[PDB]
């Protein structure tokens, strides 16, 4: 197994995957690493199993159909994995915890949003469709772009949104376009 957390790239108290060489801090894995279960298989492994069981699940899909999907166990898992792929980027630090807004010439967003809030909402089964989760994720970056205006710090929202969108297209097998 790896000697660093797959998500944050630090050592510490790591739980090791049985079916692949990845390791995780308890609360870095999503969902949080399960109490018992021997063997244990990480989220990467669980996603790969879905694909192997149904190879056609990789054929291209329309985003509008994906978003309307109910949050059954397989879609729950895909959203968890997509959230995890965002936390894997170190620039997710800026979007993880609850933001506050006091900048001359800007007003805060009407509906603040942050990664840990989305994480709690997924854990508590608050989303009934994929659209709920995607809307909140995109709201994080939209709020940031609007608040920071012409400051160069706006680029951090563009960068992390690009990680989100690439991973959304990969995990949910969105049909490739020009």
Using DSSP's 3-state secondary structure scheme, residue 16 falls into strand
Least Å from the CB of residue 55 to Zn ion: 7
Minimum CB–partner distance for residue 54 and Zn ion (Å)? 3
Between CA 154 and CA 21 the distance in angstroms is 36
20 binds Zn ion (CB under 5 A): yes
| Least Cβ distance, residue 69 to Zn ion (angstroms) | 16
The nearest distance, CB 7 to Zn ion, in angstroms, is: 5
5: contact with Zn ion by CB under 5 A: yes
Query: What values do phi and psi take at 8, rounded to 5?
Result: -105, -10
Other beta carbons within 10 angstroms of residue 176's beta carbon come to: 7
Does 28 bind Zn ion (CB under 5 A)? Our answer is yes
The sign of the CA dihedral 16, 123, 76, 141 is negative
**Does 8 engage in binding with Zn ion (CB under 5 A)?**
yes
Q: Which of 15, 25, 77, 172 binds Zn ion (CB under 5 A)?
A: 25
CA distance 159 to 77: 24
Q: Is 163 in the site for Zn ion (CB under 5 A)?
A: no
The whole-angstrom separation of Cα 87 and Cα 119 is 10
Residues that bind Zn ion (CB under 5 A): 5, 7-8, 17, 20, 22, 25, 28, 42, 44-45, 54
């Amino acid at each position: 197994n790896s000697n660093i957390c797959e998500v944050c790239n630090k050592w510490g108290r790591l739980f090791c995957c049985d079916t692949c060489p990845r390791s995780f801090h308890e609360h870095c894995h999503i969902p949080s690493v399960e109490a018992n279960k021997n063997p244990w298989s990480c989220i990467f492994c669980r996603i790969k199993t879905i694909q192997e069981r149904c190879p056609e699940s990789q054929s291209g899909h329309q985003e509008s159909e994906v978003l309307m999907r109910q949050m059954l166990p397989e879609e729950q898992l895909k959203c968890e994995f997509l959230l995890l792929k965002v936390y894997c980027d170190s620039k997710s630090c800026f979007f993880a915890s609850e933001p506050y807004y006091n900048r001359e010439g800007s007003q805060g967003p009407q509906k603040p949003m942050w990664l840990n809030k989305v994480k709690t909402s997924l854990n508590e089964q608050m989303y009934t469709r994929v659209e709920g989760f995607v809307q909140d994720m995109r709201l994080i970056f939209h709020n940031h772009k609007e608040f920071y205006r012409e400051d160069k710090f706006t680029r951090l929202g563009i960068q992390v949104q690009d990680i989100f969108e690439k991973n959304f297209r990969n995990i949910f097998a969105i049909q490739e376009t020009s």
